[PDB]
Amino acid sequence: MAVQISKKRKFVADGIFKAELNEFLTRELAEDGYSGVEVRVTPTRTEIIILATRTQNVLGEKGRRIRELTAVVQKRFGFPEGSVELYAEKVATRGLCAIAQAESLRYKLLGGLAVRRACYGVLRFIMESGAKGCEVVVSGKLRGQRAKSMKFVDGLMIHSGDPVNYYVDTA
Amino acid sequence: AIHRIRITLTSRNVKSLEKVCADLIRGAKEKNLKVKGPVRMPTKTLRITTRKTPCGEGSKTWDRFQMRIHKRLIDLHSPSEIVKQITSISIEPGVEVEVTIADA
Amino acid sequence: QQLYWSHPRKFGQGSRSCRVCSNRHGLIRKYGLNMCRQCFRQYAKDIGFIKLD
Amino acid sequence: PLQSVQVFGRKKTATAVAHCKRGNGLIKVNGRPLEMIEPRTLQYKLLEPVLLLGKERFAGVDIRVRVKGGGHVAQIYAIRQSISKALVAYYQKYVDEASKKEIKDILIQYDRTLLVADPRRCESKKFGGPGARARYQKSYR
Amino acid sequence: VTVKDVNQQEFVRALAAFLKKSGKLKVPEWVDTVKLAKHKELAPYDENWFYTRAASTARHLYLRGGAGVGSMTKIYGGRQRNGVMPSHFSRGSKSVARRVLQALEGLKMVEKDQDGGRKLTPQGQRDLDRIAGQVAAAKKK
Amino acid sequence: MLMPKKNRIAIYELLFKEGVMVAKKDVHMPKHPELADKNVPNLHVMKAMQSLKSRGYVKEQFAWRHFYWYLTNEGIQYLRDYLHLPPEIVPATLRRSR
Amino acid sequence: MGRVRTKTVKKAARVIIEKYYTRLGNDFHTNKRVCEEIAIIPSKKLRNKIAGYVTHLMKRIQRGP
RNA sequence: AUUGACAGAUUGAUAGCUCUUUCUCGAUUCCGUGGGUGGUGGUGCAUGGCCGUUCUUAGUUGGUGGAGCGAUUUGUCUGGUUAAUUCCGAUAACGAACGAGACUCUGGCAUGCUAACUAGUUACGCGACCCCCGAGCGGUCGGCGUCCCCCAACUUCUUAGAGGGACAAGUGGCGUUCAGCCACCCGAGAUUGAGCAAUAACAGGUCUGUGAUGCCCUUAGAUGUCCGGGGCUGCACGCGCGCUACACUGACUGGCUCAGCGUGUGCCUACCCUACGCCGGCAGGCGCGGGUAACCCGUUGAACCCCAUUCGUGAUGGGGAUCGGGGAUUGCAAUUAUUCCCCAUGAACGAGGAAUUCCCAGUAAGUGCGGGUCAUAAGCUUGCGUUGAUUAAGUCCCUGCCCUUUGUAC
To answer: Which is one Gene Ontology cellular component term of this protein (chain F) (predicted)?
Structure first.
C-alpha cells in the first residue's frame, strides 16, 4: 500500500514481469502469429501492446480472446479492475520478424511438409520481405535416428561485434 | 500557491532519459518560472556474474550481466496544473517519473 | 492429515525455489530475482540485464 | 581582489587539492604542516618542490591542501604534485609567464611527475585467476 | 598553536601524564585482568594503559566529533589471527571505550552531543590544546 | 459433482463470474489467491479444473508454474447445467468494445 | 609494429581523393573535418583514421602520381 | 454405494496407520478396461537448448570464368609487409560473403561547456557560536568542530551528460623511397583492459535447470508424495585446487593513519543494513532512532604499511594443529564438536626429493574489504581497491599452434 520498493529492485521486478508475460503470450498465441509485447505504464493505466500477424484471430470472435487475456493478466499479476488493457497491433513486414518466421516454420514442420522444403520456402519469404540476409538452422533427428543439422543460409549476415545486438533479429 | 515541486526521472536507458529531461526543461522555460538544472545522480550498476555453463564441466567461464540505472531529478517552483501539463508530455519510453510535492 | 506439510519450511533452500523452473539449486536471490541461474541466463535480455563487460 | 588558485594532484585514487593564496607561505596539508603527514620516510617527497625552488619562490603564497582517497604513499605523491602544480598555476596567472616557465623547467629536470599525473591505475581481475594476469594453478594429471 | 601542529605520538604521551597527575579519571576494577579486544593474544605491557587510551580517545574526539562507542571500537580495530584460517577485522572492546568515555564525562573533558555520540567540550579543549603548546615549547627538534 | 460441495461449487461460480481463471502450481496454499471465502485452497481449485479439462469443459496454458484456464462454450453450458442457471446468465464476455 | 590500415580505410580515402582532391590538404585537422562533411563516416575513430590516410595519399600525390 | 473418526491396546508419533467401539459428506465411492498422471528413475550413444573444447590462432566460403575423365583445383599467391588471408604488389582469374579490423563497454586528458541542499560546499563573508580553544600584554593571526540557512559565489575536487581529444599526424632515418618499420618532438605514441566473436566439427558435458523432450521403465505394499531418524562428513591409504606457517625484512603491546567496487528491511511467503545510549571481560543483551538510499549506516576512520614495545636465534613470546572445561548467539532441533567468545593444551613444521604451475606494468606478490551462497556463514569464489618489485622486450631448444614445399603402405 505504502511500500515504494527499491529503485534497484523495482526495475528488476518490472523486467521480470515483462519476461513472464512474453513467455505466456508466446505459449498461448504460438500458432496465432505472436511477434512480441510492448508494455508501457501510465497514470492509473498500464497499456500492453500485442504484436502479431493474424490480429483477427488473437482478438477472437466479436471481441472475446483479448478480453479473456486481460482478465487472466489482471488475475495473475495483481492488477486492479481496469488498470490494464491489451491492444493488438498488426506487425508491419512480418517477414523481417524472426520469431514469427520461426513459428511459421514450426507449424509447417508439425503439419508434415519435408524438413528441407518448408525451411527453404521460409527462407525465400524472409528474403523477398527485404532483408540484408539470413541464416536458418533446423537441427536434431532429420531422418534416421542419428542427429544431424540443416543449415540454410543466404545473403549478408553478421555474428561478431556489438552491431549484432540491433542488426540481427534472432529467434 | 507556488511551491518547490520536484520531478525525478529514473531509467534504464540513457538517451531516452536525457531527451525527456530536455523536454521538461523546455516546458519549464516556455511557462517560465525556474529549473535548478537536471541533477545527474551517480548511476548504479546492477550486476550479476553467473557461470556460462549449465552443469559444472566445461572450462569455468563466466557471464557478467550488467544493468545500468540512471536518475535525473529536476527541481521546480510552480503550481500543480503546470506540472501535470508538463509531465503528461514526454512518455512512451521506460522513463519512470516520480513527482514529489515539497521539501520531502 | 495435520502433519502432511508440517515441517518448518520457513528458511533455507527447502523454502525458496525458482519462479520459473521451480528447482531449488543456484537461485539468483540478488535484487529479488529468485530464479534458477540457468533460467536467469535464459531470460536476462528481457529482464534488462546485458553483457557489456 | 584576492589571488586564489585551486589546483589538484592525483595518484591512483588520491585527489589532493592544494589551494594557493596571497599569504606568508605556511603550506599545510589538511590541517597540519609538512613536518608530519606521517609516512615520514617520504617527507623529502612532500618537501621536494620547496627544496628545489627554495623558500623565496613560495615566500608570499600560503597554500592550504586537502586530500582524500588513495593510500598513504599515493596521497603524498598527490600533494607533492598538487602544491607544485598550484604554485605554477599561481605564477601563470598572478605573476609572469617567464617566471612560471623557469619554475616548470626546474621541476621537470628533477621529475616530470611533479606536474604530469601518472595514468597508471589498478587493472581489473578476470575470472580464472586470483588477479588480473595471474591464473589459478593447473592440475593436469 | 593548536594540537594538529604537534606530532600526535608525543602528544598522547603528554596527555597521559596529564591525566595521571590530575588523578581523578575513574579507572575501573578490571584494568589489570582485561584483554582489551578479541584481537589480542595478550593484555597491554604498559600497566597504566587506561590513561593512555583515554588520552587517545580525547584527542580523537578533538579531531573528529560525534564519536560514539561503536565509533570508538571501529577506530581501535585491527587484525584477528584465526591462526590456521586467514585474518579479518575485529572491532575493539566496547566496554573499555564506554568506560573511557564515561570517565572523560566525569572529568568534564567531554559531553554527549545532540544527534548522538560524544564530543569534547571547551574545558576539555583547554587541556588538550594547553599540552599541545607545552610540547611545541619543549625544544626545537 | 465431487468432494466438499461448498468448495467445489464456489470454484465453479468464480470460474463462471469471470471468463477465465488461474492458480499457481503450488499444492500447499490454505487460502488461494482471490476467492478466499473459507480455506477453499489451491488444489480443489486445481483438481477441479483438471477434471473440467479432462471431460473437455475448459482449456489450458501453464507458463512459469501458474496455470491459465480459458473456458469453452461447451464448458459454459456444462457449468450452467451444474448450477441450474438461467439462459441469459452473462458469464464475462459482454464488454463494450467501442 | 602494429597499425596497418584495413581496406575499409584505404578504399574510402582513395574514393574521397578521387572526388574531392581540391578540398583536401596536407594539414590533417582541416581535412579531418572535410572527411566529416563530404562523407557519412559512422564512427569517430574510423573518420579519424581515414583522414590520416587521406593526408598520406596527398603527400604521395604532391611528388608524382 | 461405502469419502472422513476422541478411545484405549499398538506406535517414534497427539500417523483414526490398525484391533476395539460411536457415527458421517451424502452421491463422494470401490472394481474392471481403456487410459491417464507423476518420477533428481534409465538413456546425453535417441534428441532440443546451453555451455565447453578443437582453436584465440588466422582461418572459412560459395557465383561466374579457367585447369582436370574425375575426386578436386584455381580464386584463397612467388616476394615484402602486418597482431591478422592486415596491407602493397604480382596474377586464369573476376567481382563478393563471413571472420580479423571496424564495433560496444571500460581506463586515463580536459581551470572547455551544461550541472546541482540526495556533491562539494569552494574559497569568501567569517554573520558567527564557542570557551582561553591556542599564539600572544592586547590587537591580528593558526586550527578545526561545526550553527548556518538563503534573499552569499561558483564548479578547482564531485556526480554524469554531449562534445572534443591521437591520426601513425609531425621531424629524422630505414624500406621498391609502396605497404610499412625504427627512433625523437609535441604530448596518452599505433598497444589500457574486457565484451562480442567464422566455417566445419566432437558421437565433450549436461535428461540432477526447465510445465524443452523421444523411447524404455515404474505407477498404490509406488522409483509418486509427505513425515521421523540416519547418511552424503564414516578412515589401513593415494592424488587435486586451497589456507596457515616455518619467524627478528620478524612477534607481541600500545600509538599514528590513508581506499575502492558494492550491498541493505517494509520481499514470491518472513524477514534487512544498522547509527547513538546503557548492562556484560568477551561472544553478546536491552533500549530507543535513521535508512527502499549520492539522504541513514558512512569523512564507509580496512588491512598491510608507518611510529614507539618488549623478546633475542632457543621448535623461542615463531607455528597454532589436536584436545579438556566453561560461556554466547542462529535455529523446531546442533550430539558426530553449526558458528562466535573465553580459559587451558601447545603437535608436525628450522624453506621442502624427482616433479611441475603461474606471470611482463599498477602487472607478480603481499595486503585487507565488498558481492555470491547465507536462519546460522567462508580455508571457495567473483569483484574492489591499498603497497608495489626482479627480469624480458627475445627465440624456436622443449611444448604446442599457423602457412608453404615435400614424403606417406595412415
So the answer is: cytosolic small ribosomal subunit
